[PDB]
Nucleic acid binder design. Structure first.
Lengths: 276, 276
DNA sequence: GGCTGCGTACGTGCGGGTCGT
DNA sequence: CACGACCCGCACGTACGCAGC
Protein backbone atom coordinates (compact mmCIF):
# COMPACT_ATOMS: atom_id res chain seq x y z
CA UNK A 1 0.00 0.00 0.00
CA UNK A 2 2.06 2.85 1.44
CA UNK A 3 5.66 1.64 1.09
CA UNK A 4 5.25 2.32 -2.63
CA UNK A 5 3.89 5.69 -1.51
CA UNK A 6 6.81 6.34 0.88
CA UNK A 7 9.62 5.74 -1.60
CA UNK A 8 7.66 6.80 -4.71
CA UNK A 9 6.69 10.12 -3.08
CA UNK A 10 10.25 10.53 -1.76
CA UNK A 11 11.43 10.02 -5.35
CA UNK A 12 8.98 12.67 -6.59
CA UNK A 13 10.24 15.07 -3.92
CA UNK A 14 13.77 14.28 -5.10
CA UNK A 15 13.08 15.14 -8.75
CA UNK A 16 11.24 18.24 -7.50
CA UNK A 17 14.09 19.54 -5.35
CA UNK A 18 16.69 18.87 -8.05
CA UNK A 19 14.69 20.87 -10.60
CA UNK A 20 14.17 23.70 -8.09
CA UNK A 21 17.86 24.08 -7.27
CA UNK A 22 19.13 23.89 -10.84
CA UNK A 23 16.50 26.47 -11.85
CA UNK A 24 17.88 28.50 -8.95
CA UNK A 25 21.45 27.94 -10.14
CA UNK A 26 20.75 29.39 -13.58
CA UNK A 27 19.39 32.75 -12.27
CA UNK A 28 21.07 36.06 -13.26
CA UNK A 29 22.51 36.34 -9.75
CA UNK A 30 26.05 35.07 -9.07
CA UNK A 31 26.63 31.44 -8.18
CA UNK A 32 27.18 32.58 -4.58
CA UNK A 33 23.58 33.42 -3.68
CA UNK A 34 21.84 31.65 -6.58
CA UNK A 35 23.16 28.40 -5.07
CA UNK A 36 21.98 28.54 -1.44
CA UNK A 37 18.61 30.24 -1.94
CA UNK A 38 15.07 30.05 -0.56
CA UNK A 39 12.73 27.64 -2.36
CA UNK A 40 9.79 30.04 -2.88
CA UNK A 41 12.03 33.04 -3.55
CA UNK A 42 13.33 30.91 -6.44
CA UNK A 43 9.98 31.08 -8.23
CA UNK A 44 9.57 34.73 -7.18
CA UNK A 45 12.78 35.60 -9.01
CA UNK A 46 12.17 33.42 -12.08
CA UNK A 47 8.61 34.70 -12.46
CA UNK A 48 9.70 38.33 -12.15
CA UNK A 49 12.49 37.64 -14.65
CA UNK A 50 10.25 36.31 -17.42
CA UNK A 51 7.68 38.97 -16.54
CA UNK A 52 10.39 41.66 -16.77
CA UNK A 53 11.85 40.47 -20.09
CA UNK A 54 8.35 40.39 -21.58
CA UNK A 55 8.04 43.82 -19.94
CA UNK A 56 11.09 45.19 -21.74
CA UNK A 57 10.76 43.67 -25.23
CA UNK A 58 7.04 44.54 -25.57
CA UNK A 59 7.50 48.32 -25.44
CA UNK A 60 9.20 51.20 -27.20
CA UNK A 61 36.67 52.54 -24.51
CA UNK A 62 36.32 49.04 -23.11
CA UNK A 63 36.57 49.59 -19.35
CA UNK A 64 33.85 52.30 -19.17
CA UNK A 65 31.63 49.70 -20.91
CA UNK A 66 32.41 46.40 -19.13
CA UNK A 67 31.13 47.88 -15.87
CA UNK A 68 28.13 49.65 -17.40
CA UNK A 69 25.74 48.17 -14.83
CA UNK A 70 27.70 48.96 -11.67
CA UNK A 71 28.55 52.44 -12.98
CA UNK A 72 24.93 53.36 -13.75
CA UNK A 73 23.72 51.84 -10.49
CA UNK A 74 26.40 53.11 -8.09
CA UNK A 75 26.41 56.53 -9.73
CA UNK A 76 22.76 57.15 -8.87
CA UNK A 77 21.82 58.43 -5.41
CA UNK A 78 18.90 56.02 -5.31
CA UNK A 79 17.57 52.66 -6.45
CA UNK A 80 15.82 51.96 -9.75
CA UNK A 81 12.91 49.54 -10.10
CA UNK A 82 10.25 48.44 -12.58
CA UNK A 83 6.69 47.37 -11.75
CA UNK A 84 3.87 46.07 -13.94
CA UNK A 85 0.13 46.62 -14.46
CA UNK A 86 -0.54 45.06 -11.04
CA UNK A 87 2.17 46.55 -8.81
CA UNK A 88 4.59 43.62 -8.59
CA UNK A 89 8.25 44.61 -8.64
CA UNK A 90 9.41 43.16 -11.94
CA UNK A 91 12.91 44.48 -11.19
CA UNK A 92 14.84 46.40 -8.55
CA UNK A 93 18.55 47.14 -8.44
CA UNK A 94 20.59 45.74 -5.56
CA UNK A 95 21.49 49.29 -4.50
CA UNK A 96 18.15 49.60 -2.67
CA UNK A 97 19.85 47.70 0.16
CA UNK A 98 21.93 50.86 0.64
CA UNK A 99 19.02 53.24 1.26
CA UNK A 100 16.19 51.06 2.64
CA UNK A 101 17.91 47.88 3.87
CA UNK A 102 15.69 45.70 1.70
CA UNK A 103 17.09 42.64 -0.06
CA UNK A 104 16.90 42.57 -3.86
CA UNK A 105 15.98 38.88 -3.70
CA UNK A 106 13.35 39.75 -1.10
CA UNK A 107 11.66 42.53 -3.15
CA UNK A 108 11.80 41.02 -6.67
CA UNK A 109 8.28 39.63 -7.22
CA UNK A 110 6.30 41.06 -4.32
CA UNK A 111 3.60 43.70 -4.61
CA UNK A 112 4.97 47.22 -4.12
CA UNK A 113 2.07 47.91 -1.74
CA UNK A 114 3.62 45.36 0.64
CA UNK A 115 6.66 47.58 1.20
CA UNK A 116 5.08 51.05 1.11
CA UNK A 117 3.60 52.72 4.18
CA UNK A 118 -0.19 52.17 4.37
CA UNK A 119 -2.20 55.35 4.24
CA UNK A 120 -0.12 56.25 1.19
CA UNK A 121 -1.42 53.18 -0.67
CA UNK A 122 -4.41 54.78 -2.42
CA UNK A 123 -2.05 57.55 -3.50
CA UNK A 124 0.18 55.06 -5.32
CA UNK A 125 -2.68 52.90 -6.59
CA UNK A 126 -3.91 56.25 -7.89
CA UNK A 127 -0.56 56.93 -9.54
CA UNK A 128 -0.39 53.57 -11.35
CA UNK A 129 -4.07 53.66 -12.30
CA UNK A 130 -5.52 50.96 -10.04
CA UNK A 131 2.20 60.22 -18.70
CA UNK A 132 5.03 61.34 -16.43
CA UNK A 133 5.12 60.34 -12.77
CA UNK A 134 6.62 62.09 -9.75
CA UNK A 135 5.59 61.75 -6.11
CA UNK A 136 6.56 61.17 -2.49
CA UNK A 137 5.85 57.96 -0.57
CA UNK A 138 7.02 56.18 2.59
CA UNK A 139 8.90 52.88 2.26
CA UNK A 140 9.88 50.29 4.88
CA UNK A 141 13.41 51.26 6.01
CA UNK A 142 15.16 48.78 8.29
CA UNK A 143 18.09 50.96 9.38
CA UNK A 144 10.38 52.81 10.61
CA UNK A 145 9.75 54.41 7.22
CA UNK A 146 11.74 56.54 4.78
CA UNK A 147 10.42 59.38 2.62
CA UNK A 148 11.14 57.97 -0.85
CA UNK A 149 10.87 60.44 -3.74
CA UNK A 150 10.26 58.65 -7.03
CA UNK A 151 10.31 59.91 -10.62
CA UNK A 152 9.46 57.82 -13.66
CA UNK A 153 6.97 56.99 -16.40
CA UNK A 154 3.99 54.70 -16.62
CA UNK A 155 3.95 53.16 -20.13
CA UNK A 156 0.34 48.82 -17.82
CA UNK A 157 3.37 49.19 -15.57
CA UNK A 158 5.47 51.93 -13.97
CA UNK A 159 9.23 52.39 -14.25
CA UNK A 160 10.94 54.47 -11.61
CA UNK A 161 14.19 55.85 -10.29
CA UNK A 162 13.83 56.61 -6.57
CA UNK A 163 16.01 58.34 -4.01
CA UNK A 164 15.89 58.56 -0.23
CA UNK A 165 16.03 61.55 2.13
CA UNK A 166 17.63 62.05 5.60
CA UNK A 167 25.92 76.92 -4.57
CA UNK A 168 23.25 76.33 -1.94
CA UNK A 169 22.10 77.84 1.33
CA UNK A 170 20.03 76.71 4.31
CA UNK A 171 17.10 78.53 5.89
CA UNK A 172 15.28 77.66 9.10
CA UNK A 173 11.57 78.45 8.97
CA UNK A 174 8.43 77.79 11.00
CA UNK A 175 5.79 75.32 9.83
CA UNK A 176 3.97 78.14 8.01
CA UNK A 177 7.23 78.80 6.12
CA UNK A 178 8.14 81.90 8.15
CA UNK A 179 11.89 82.45 7.67
CA UNK A 180 13.38 81.88 11.14
CA UNK A 181 17.14 81.61 10.52
CA UNK A 182 19.16 82.12 7.35
CA UNK A 183 22.79 81.60 6.36
CA UNK A 184 24.81 84.66 5.35
CA UNK A 185 25.80 83.11 1.99
CA UNK A 186 22.52 84.35 0.51
CA UNK A 187 24.23 87.67 -0.18
CA UNK A 188 26.37 85.61 -2.56
CA UNK A 189 23.38 84.82 -4.75
CA UNK A 190 20.51 87.18 -3.85
CA UNK A 191 19.90 90.88 -3.32
CA UNK A 192 18.74 90.66 0.30
CA UNK A 193 20.65 89.62 3.43
CA UNK A 194 19.37 87.27 6.20
CA UNK A 195 17.45 90.13 7.87
CA UNK A 196 15.22 91.51 5.11
CA UNK A 197 13.73 88.03 4.61
CA UNK A 198 13.45 86.88 8.23
CA UNK A 199 10.10 87.76 9.76
CA UNK A 200 8.06 87.34 6.59
CA UNK A 201 7.09 83.95 5.17
CA UNK A 202 8.16 82.11 2.03
CA UNK A 203 4.93 83.03 0.24
CA UNK A 204 5.72 86.76 0.01
CA UNK A 205 8.71 85.77 -2.15
CA UNK A 206 7.58 82.98 -4.50
CA UNK A 207 6.78 83.97 -8.08
CA UNK A 208 2.99 84.18 -8.07
CA UNK A 209 2.64 81.54 -10.82
CA UNK A 210 4.54 79.01 -8.68
CA UNK A 211 2.72 79.64 -5.37
CA UNK A 212 0.40 76.82 -6.43
CA UNK A 213 3.23 74.29 -6.74
CA UNK A 214 5.09 75.42 -3.62
CA UNK A 215 1.74 75.21 -1.83
CA UNK A 216 1.31 71.58 -2.87
CA UNK A 217 4.87 70.78 -1.77
CA UNK A 218 4.07 72.44 1.57
CA UNK A 219 1.15 70.02 1.87
CA UNK A 220 3.25 66.93 1.11
CA UNK A 221 5.99 68.10 3.49
CA UNK A 222 3.35 68.56 6.18
CA UNK A 223 1.80 65.11 5.88
CA UNK A 224 4.93 63.00 5.20
CA UNK A 225 7.67 65.02 6.95
CA UNK A 226 9.94 65.63 3.93
CA UNK A 227 9.69 67.11 0.45
CA UNK A 228 11.44 68.43 -2.64
CA UNK A 229 9.84 71.38 -4.42
CA UNK A 230 9.76 72.04 -8.17
CA UNK A 231 12.04 74.52 -9.93
CA UNK A 232 10.52 77.80 -8.74
CA UNK A 233 11.30 81.52 -8.88
CA UNK A 234 12.28 83.58 -5.82
CA UNK A 235 11.76 87.28 -6.51
CA UNK A 236 14.64 89.65 -5.81
CA UNK A 237 14.38 92.91 -3.90
CA UNK A 238 14.92 95.03 -7.03
CA UNK A 239 13.08 93.05 -9.72
CA UNK A 240 12.79 89.66 -11.37
CA UNK A 241 13.67 86.40 -9.62
CA UNK A 242 16.24 83.62 -9.40
CA UNK A 243 15.54 79.91 -9.80
CA UNK A 244 15.65 77.70 -6.68
CA UNK A 245 14.98 74.07 -5.84
CA UNK A 246 14.64 73.24 -2.14
CA UNK A 247 15.01 69.99 -0.19
CA UNK A 248 12.92 70.54 2.93
CA UNK A 249 12.38 68.62 6.17
CA UNK A 250 10.55 68.94 9.51
CA UNK A 251 10.72 67.88 13.23
CA UNK A 252 9.64 71.35 15.03
CA UNK A 253 11.63 73.57 12.68
CA UNK A 254 11.46 73.31 8.90
CA UNK A 255 14.90 73.33 7.32
CA UNK A 256 14.88 74.48 3.73
CA UNK A 257 17.91 73.49 1.63
CA UNK A 258 17.98 75.88 -1.34
CA UNK A 259 19.92 74.60 -4.34
CA UNK A 260 20.74 77.48 -6.68
CA UNK A 261 19.85 77.06 -10.36
CA UNK A 262 20.46 80.37 -12.18
CA UNK A 263 21.49 84.01 -11.86
CA UNK A 264 19.02 86.91 -11.50
CA UNK A 265 16.89 86.98 -14.65
CA UNK A 266 14.88 89.99 -15.84
CA UNK A 267 16.12 92.30 -13.10
CA UNK A 268 14.58 95.59 -14.35
CA UNK A 269 10.79 95.39 -14.26
CA UNK A 270 9.35 94.95 -10.74
CA UNK A 271 6.81 92.21 -10.07
CA UNK A 272 5.81 92.50 -6.39
CA UNK A 273 5.19 95.57 -4.24
CA UNK A 274 8.18 94.39 -2.18
CA UNK A 275 10.22 95.60 -5.18
CA UNK A 276 9.19 99.26 -4.91
CA UNK B 1 -2.38 27.01 19.91
CA UNK B 2 0.42 25.81 17.61
CA UNK B 3 -1.27 22.91 15.78
CA UNK B 4 -3.96 25.02 14.09
CA UNK B 5 -1.73 28.07 13.52
CA UNK B 6 0.70 25.71 11.75
CA UNK B 7 -1.78 23.65 9.72
CA UNK B 8 -3.21 26.94 8.44
CA UNK B 9 0.25 28.42 7.80
CA UNK B 10 0.99 25.32 5.71
CA UNK B 11 -2.32 25.63 3.86
CA UNK B 12 -1.36 29.22 3.05
CA UNK B 13 1.95 27.86 1.74
CA UNK B 14 0.14 25.41 -0.54
CA UNK B 15 -2.19 28.04 -1.99
CA UNK B 16 0.80 30.35 -2.44
CA UNK B 17 3.21 27.78 -3.91
CA UNK B 18 0.67 26.22 -6.28
CA UNK B 19 -0.25 29.79 -7.28
CA UNK B 20 3.38 30.41 -8.27
CA UNK B 21 3.25 27.11 -10.17
CA UNK B 22 0.07 27.94 -12.07
CA UNK B 23 1.16 31.56 -12.54
CA UNK B 24 4.42 30.40 -14.14
CA UNK B 25 2.40 27.83 -16.12
CA UNK B 26 0.99 30.47 -18.49
CA UNK B 27 4.38 32.25 -18.62
CA UNK B 28 6.59 29.69 -20.39
CA UNK B 29 4.68 29.43 -23.70
CA UNK B 30 5.18 25.65 -23.89
CA UNK B 31 2.60 25.19 -21.12
CA UNK B 32 0.37 28.00 -22.44
CA UNK B 33 0.10 26.42 -25.91
CA UNK B 34 -0.46 22.88 -24.61
CA UNK B 35 -3.93 21.30 -24.65
CA UNK B 36 -4.44 20.73 -20.90
CA UNK B 37 -2.72 21.52 -17.61
CA UNK B 38 0.48 19.47 -17.32
CA UNK B 39 2.16 17.64 -14.46
CA UNK B 40 3.76 20.01 -11.95
CA UNK B 41 7.10 18.25 -12.49
CA UNK B 42 6.91 18.34 -16.30
CA UNK B 43 5.73 21.96 -15.97
CA UNK B 44 8.92 23.05 -14.22
CA UNK B 45 11.08 20.83 -16.44
CA UNK B 46 9.66 22.85 -19.34
CA UNK B 47 10.46 25.92 -17.23
CA UNK B 48 14.16 25.14 -16.79
CA UNK B 49 14.37 24.01 -20.43
CA UNK B 50 12.99 27.31 -21.72
CA UNK B 51 14.83 29.34 -19.07
CA UNK B 52 18.23 27.89 -20.01
CA UNK B 53 17.25 28.96 -23.57
CA UNK B 54 18.52 32.46 -22.70
CA UNK B 55 24.25 43.39 -13.43
CA UNK B 56 21.13 41.47 -12.36
CA UNK B 57 18.09 40.45 -14.45
CA UNK B 58 18.67 43.23 -17.00
CA UNK B 59 21.31 43.55 -19.70
CA UNK B 60 23.43 46.67 -20.19
CA UNK B 61 21.09 47.70 -23.01
CA UNK B 62 17.85 47.10 -21.08
CA UNK B 63 19.21 49.00 -18.05
CA UNK B 64 20.37 51.88 -20.26
CA UNK B 65 17.00 52.15 -22.02
CA UNK B 66 15.28 51.70 -18.65
CA UNK B 67 17.26 54.60 -17.22
CA UNK B 68 16.22 56.60 -20.30
CA UNK B 69 12.50 55.85 -20.13
CA UNK B 70 12.79 56.17 -16.34
CA UNK B 71 14.02 59.75 -16.15
CA UNK B 72 15.74 60.85 -19.35
CA UNK B 73 19.03 59.60 -17.95
CA UNK B 74 22.29 59.25 -19.88
CA UNK B 75 25.74 58.20 -18.73
CA UNK B 76 28.78 60.38 -19.29
CA UNK B 77 32.39 60.36 -18.07
CA UNK B 78 34.60 63.47 -18.16
CA UNK B 79 38.02 64.31 -16.74
CA UNK B 80 38.23 65.72 -13.20
CA UNK B 81 40.51 68.64 -14.16
CA UNK B 82 40.13 69.36 -17.87
CA UNK B 83 36.45 68.60 -18.42
CA UNK B 84 37.15 66.41 -21.46
CA UNK B 85 34.15 64.19 -22.15
CA UNK B 86 35.96 60.87 -22.52
CA UNK B 87 32.68 58.95 -22.78
CA UNK B 88 28.96 59.43 -23.26
CA UNK B 89 26.16 56.99 -23.86
CA UNK B 90 23.91 57.41 -26.88
CA UNK B 91 20.93 58.17 -24.62
CA UNK B 92 22.08 61.81 -24.89
CA UNK B 93 20.24 62.05 -28.22
CA UNK B 94 16.67 61.51 -26.89
CA UNK B 95 17.68 63.69 -23.92
CA UNK B 96 19.40 66.79 -25.33
CA UNK B 97 19.32 66.44 -29.17
CA UNK B 98 23.12 66.37 -29.32
CA UNK B 99 24.60 63.73 -31.63
CA UNK B 100 26.93 61.38 -29.79
CA UNK B 101 29.88 62.79 -31.78
CA UNK B 102 29.36 66.43 -30.79
CA UNK B 103 29.49 65.28 -27.15
CA UNK B 104 32.41 62.82 -27.28
CA UNK B 105 35.83 64.46 -27.11
CA UNK B 106 34.58 67.94 -26.16
CA UNK B 107 34.42 69.61 -22.73
CA UNK B 108 31.61 69.65 -20.19
CA UNK B 109 32.45 73.30 -19.51
CA UNK B 110 31.73 73.89 -23.21
CA UNK B 111 28.37 72.06 -23.07
CA UNK B 112 26.77 73.63 -19.97
CA UNK B 113 25.35 77.13 -19.63
CA UNK B 114 27.99 79.91 -19.56
CA UNK B 115 26.80 80.91 -16.09
CA UNK B 116 26.71 77.25 -14.97
CA UNK B 117 30.48 76.84 -15.47
CA UNK B 118 31.57 78.07 -12.03
CA UNK B 119 29.54 75.43 -10.21
CA UNK B 120 30.65 72.92 -12.87
CA UNK B 121 34.23 73.91 -12.12
CA UNK B 122 33.54 73.38 -8.42
CA UNK B 123 32.83 69.80 -9.51
CA UNK B 124 36.13 68.96 -11.21
CA UNK B 125 38.23 69.47 -8.08
CA UNK B 126 39.59 68.91 -4.57
CA UNK B 127 40.74 70.76 -1.42
CA UNK B 128 33.83 59.78 -3.52
CA UNK B 129 30.41 60.87 -4.83
CA UNK B 130 29.12 63.90 -6.73
CA UNK B 131 25.66 65.38 -7.31
CA UNK B 132 24.78 68.77 -8.77
CA UNK B 133 22.26 70.58 -10.96
CA UNK B 134 23.29 72.32 -14.17
CA UNK B 135 21.77 73.69 -17.36
CA UNK B 136 22.81 72.14 -20.67
CA UNK B 137 22.45 73.07 -24.33
CA UNK B 138 19.97 71.27 -26.58
CA UNK B 139 20.80 71.71 -30.26
CA UNK B 140 19.64 69.75 -33.27
CA UNK B 141 14.36 74.19 -22.62
CA UNK B 142 13.10 73.62 -19.09
CA UNK B 143 13.79 76.72 -17.01
CA UNK B 144 11.45 79.58 -17.87
CA UNK B 145 9.36 80.74 -20.81
CA UNK B 146 11.11 79.82 -24.04
CA UNK B 147 12.94 82.87 -25.37
CA UNK B 148 12.59 84.25 -28.90
CA UNK B 149 14.85 82.09 -31.04
CA UNK B 150 17.50 81.38 -28.38
CA UNK B 151 19.15 78.03 -27.51
CA UNK B 152 17.50 75.57 -25.14
CA UNK B 153 19.14 74.80 -21.78
CA UNK B 154 17.54 71.97 -19.80
CA UNK B 155 18.09 71.43 -16.07
CA UNK B 156 20.09 68.21 -15.78
CA UNK B 157 20.39 66.40 -12.44
CA UNK B 158 23.89 64.90 -12.26
CA UNK B 159 24.89 62.08 -9.91
CA UNK B 160 28.01 59.94 -9.89
CA UNK B 161 31.32 59.08 -8.27
CA UNK B 162 33.98 61.48 -12.83
CA UNK B 163 31.28 58.96 -13.78
CA UNK B 164 27.79 60.41 -13.82
CA UNK B 165 24.22 59.77 -14.83
CA UNK B 166 22.55 62.96 -16.00
CA UNK B 167 18.78 62.70 -15.67
CA UNK B 168 16.09 65.22 -16.53
CA UNK B 169 13.46 66.14 -13.94
CA UNK B 170 10.76 67.15 -16.39
CA UNK B 171 8.00 67.47 -13.80
CA UNK B 172 9.28 70.78 -12.42
CA UNK B 173 9.55 73.22 -15.31
CA UNK B 174 6.22 75.16 -15.47
CA UNK B 175 -3.31 86.75 -19.62
CA UNK B 176 -1.21 87.49 -16.52
CA UNK B 177 -1.15 86.70 -12.80
CA UNK B 178 -1.32 89.26 -10.00
CA UNK B 179 -1.53 89.42 -6.21
CA UNK B 180 -3.49 91.76 -3.95
CA UNK B 181 -4.15 92.55 -0.33
CA UNK B 182 -7.64 92.12 1.12
CA UNK B 183 -8.26 95.74 0.03
CA UNK B 184 -7.47 94.88 -3.60
CA UNK B 185 -4.16 96.74 -3.91
CA UNK B 186 -1.83 95.33 -6.57
CA UNK B 187 0.89 93.64 -4.51
CA UNK B 188 2.29 91.83 -7.54
CA UNK B 189 2.00 92.02 -11.33
CA UNK B 190 3.53 89.41 -13.63
CA UNK B 191 5.26 90.85 -16.70
CA UNK B 192 2.68 89.42 -19.14
CA UNK B 193 0.52 92.49 -18.41
CA UNK B 194 2.82 94.39 -20.78
CA UNK B 195 1.41 92.35 -23.68
CA UNK B 196 -1.98 91.80 -21.98
CA UNK B 197 -3.01 95.31 -20.86
CA UNK B 198 -0.04 97.35 -22.13
CA UNK B 199 1.09 98.86 -18.83
CA UNK B 200 4.40 98.27 -17.18
CA UNK B 201 4.18 96.30 -13.91
CA UNK B 202 5.25 99.20 -11.69
CA UNK B 203 2.57 101.28 -13.46
CA UNK B 204 -0.01 99.09 -11.69
CA UNK B 205 1.76 98.29 -8.42
CA UNK B 206 0.60 99.99 -5.25
CA UNK B 207 -2.70 100.84 -6.93
CA UNK B 208 -6.21 99.42 -6.58
CA UNK B 209 -7.77 97.36 -9.37
CA UNK B 210 -11.11 99.22 -9.08
CA UNK B 211 -9.16 102.30 -10.24
CA UNK B 212 -8.63 100.64 -13.64
CA UNK B 213 -12.23 99.35 -13.71
CA UNK B 214 -15.11 100.77 -15.70
CA UNK B 215 -17.25 103.06 -13.49
CA UNK B 216 -20.25 100.83 -14.19
CA UNK B 217 -18.65 97.52 -13.09
CA UNK B 218 -16.59 98.85 -10.17
CA UNK B 219 -19.20 97.98 -7.54
CA UNK B 220 -19.28 94.44 -8.93
CA UNK B 221 -15.49 94.36 -8.64
CA UNK B 222 -15.67 95.34 -4.96
CA UNK B 223 -18.45 92.90 -4.07
CA UNK B 224 -16.49 90.13 -5.79
CA UNK B 225 -13.24 90.95 -3.98
CA UNK B 226 -15.05 91.01 -0.64
CA UNK B 227 -16.56 87.67 -1.65
CA UNK B 228 -13.27 85.90 -2.42
CA UNK B 229 -12.15 87.27 0.93
CA UNK B 230 -15.27 85.53 2.29
CA UNK B 231 -14.87 82.37 0.16
CA UNK B 232 -11.59 81.26 1.78
CA UNK B 233 -9.67 79.06 -0.66
CA UNK B 234 -12.68 78.86 -2.97
CA UNK B 235 -12.27 80.39 -6.44
CA UNK B 236 -14.48 83.13 -7.92
CA UNK B 237 -14.22 84.58 -11.42
CA UNK B 238 -15.57 87.92 -12.66
CA UNK B 239 -15.73 89.60 -16.07
CA UNK B 240 -15.25 93.37 -16.20
CA UNK B 241 -13.98 96.18 -18.41
CA UNK B 242 -10.30 97.10 -18.05
CA UNK B 243 -8.90 100.42 -19.25
CA UNK B 244 -5.64 99.47 -20.97
CA UNK B 245 -2.61 101.70 -21.49
CA UNK B 246 -3.77 102.66 -24.98
CA UNK B 247 -7.23 104.10 -24.34
CA UNK B 248 -9.52 101.09 -24.74
CA UNK B 249 -11.97 99.00 -22.71
CA UNK B 250 -10.92 95.35 -22.83
CA UNK B 251 -13.36 92.73 -21.64
CA UNK B 252 -11.44 90.78 -19.01
CA UNK B 253 -12.26 87.63 -17.06
CA UNK B 254 -10.33 87.25 -13.81
CA UNK B 255 -10.61 84.27 -11.49
CA UNK B 256 -9.32 84.91 -7.98
CA UNK B 257 -9.09 83.31 -4.55
CA UNK B 258 -7.41 83.93 -1.23
CA UNK B 259 -4.19 82.04 -0.51
CA UNK B 260 -4.54 80.58 2.98
CA UNK B 261 -1.29 79.32 4.49
CA UNK B 262 -1.25 75.49 4.56
CA UNK B 263 -0.22 75.62 8.24
CA UNK B 264 -1.09 78.86 10.10
CA UNK B 265 -4.00 79.31 7.61
CA UNK B 266 -3.42 83.08 7.43
CA UNK B 267 -4.27 85.18 4.39
CA UNK B 268 -1.03 85.60 2.48
CA UNK B 269 -2.70 87.54 -0.38
CA UNK B 270 -5.35 87.12 -3.09
CA UNK B 271 -4.20 85.62 -6.39
CA UNK B 272 -5.77 86.93 -9.60
CA UNK B 273 -5.57 85.34 -13.05
CA UNK B 274 -6.44 88.23 -15.39
CA UNK B 275 -7.29 87.03 -18.91
CA UNK B 276 -8.89 88.88 -21.83
C1' DG C 1 -17.59 -2.70 -8.03
C1' DG C 2 -11.61 -5.56 -6.99
C1' DC C 3 -6.20 -3.24 -6.98
C1' DT C 4 -2.55 -0.67 -8.48
C1' DG C 5 0.25 3.42 -11.25
C1' DC C 6 -0.12 8.50 -10.86
C1' DG C 7 -0.85 13.21 -8.52
C1' DT C 8 -2.38 16.78 -5.51
C1' DA C 9 -4.04 18.26 -0.81
C1' DC C 10 -3.65 17.94 4.59
C1' DG C 11 -1.67 17.72 8.96
C1' DT C 12 2.16 17.17 12.04
C1' DG C 13 7.01 16.34 13.60
C1' DC C 14 11.82 17.93 13.19
C1' DG C 15 16.21 20.98 12.59
C1' DG C 16 17.64 25.31 11.54
C1' DG C 17 16.47 30.18 12.16
C1' DT C 18 15.90 35.14 15.51
C1' DC C 19 14.60 37.36 19.27
C1' DG C 20 14.58 39.02 24.38
C1' DT C 21 14.71 40.11 29.56
C1' DC D 1 26.54 31.94 22.97
C1' DA D 2 23.64 30.70 25.70
C1' DC D 3 18.29 29.55 26.53
C1' DG D 4 13.69 28.40 26.12
C1' DA D 5 11.23 32.10 23.73
C1' DC D 6 9.40 30.70 19.31
C1' DC D 7 8.52 31.19 13.78
C1' DC D 8 9.26 29.52 9.68
C1' DG D 9 10.72 26.40 6.43
C1' DC D 10 10.86 21.47 4.97
C1' DA D 11 9.88 16.99 4.25
C1' DC D 12 7.66 13.20 5.65
C1' DG D 13 3.94 10.14 5.79
C1' DT D 14 -0.60 9.56 4.42
C1' DA D 15 -5.37 10.38 2.76
C1' DC D 16 -8.49 11.37 -1.10
C1' DG D 17 -9.38 11.63 -6.56
C1' DC D 18 -8.68 9.34 -11.38
C1' DA D 19 -6.66 6.35 -15.39
C1' DG D 20 -6.63 1.45 -16.86
C1' DC D 21 -5.68 -4.08 -18.59
Amino acid sequence: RKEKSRDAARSRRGKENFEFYELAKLLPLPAAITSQLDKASIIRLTISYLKMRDFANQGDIEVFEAHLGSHILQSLDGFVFALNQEGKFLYISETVSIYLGLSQVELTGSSVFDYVHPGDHVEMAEQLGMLERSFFIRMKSTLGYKVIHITGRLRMGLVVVAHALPHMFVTRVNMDLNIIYCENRISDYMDLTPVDIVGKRCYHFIHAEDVEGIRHSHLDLLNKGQCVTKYYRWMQKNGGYIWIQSSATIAKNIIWVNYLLSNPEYKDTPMDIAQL
Amino acid sequence: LARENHSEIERRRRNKMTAYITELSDMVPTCSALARKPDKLTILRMAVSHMKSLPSFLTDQELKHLILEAADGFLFIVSCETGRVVYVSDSVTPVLNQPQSEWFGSTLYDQVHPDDVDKLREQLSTSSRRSFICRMRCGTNGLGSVKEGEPHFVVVHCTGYLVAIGRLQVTSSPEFISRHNIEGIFTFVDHRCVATVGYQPQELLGKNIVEFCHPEDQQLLRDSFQQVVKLKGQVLSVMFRFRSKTREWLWMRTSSFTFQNPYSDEIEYIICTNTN
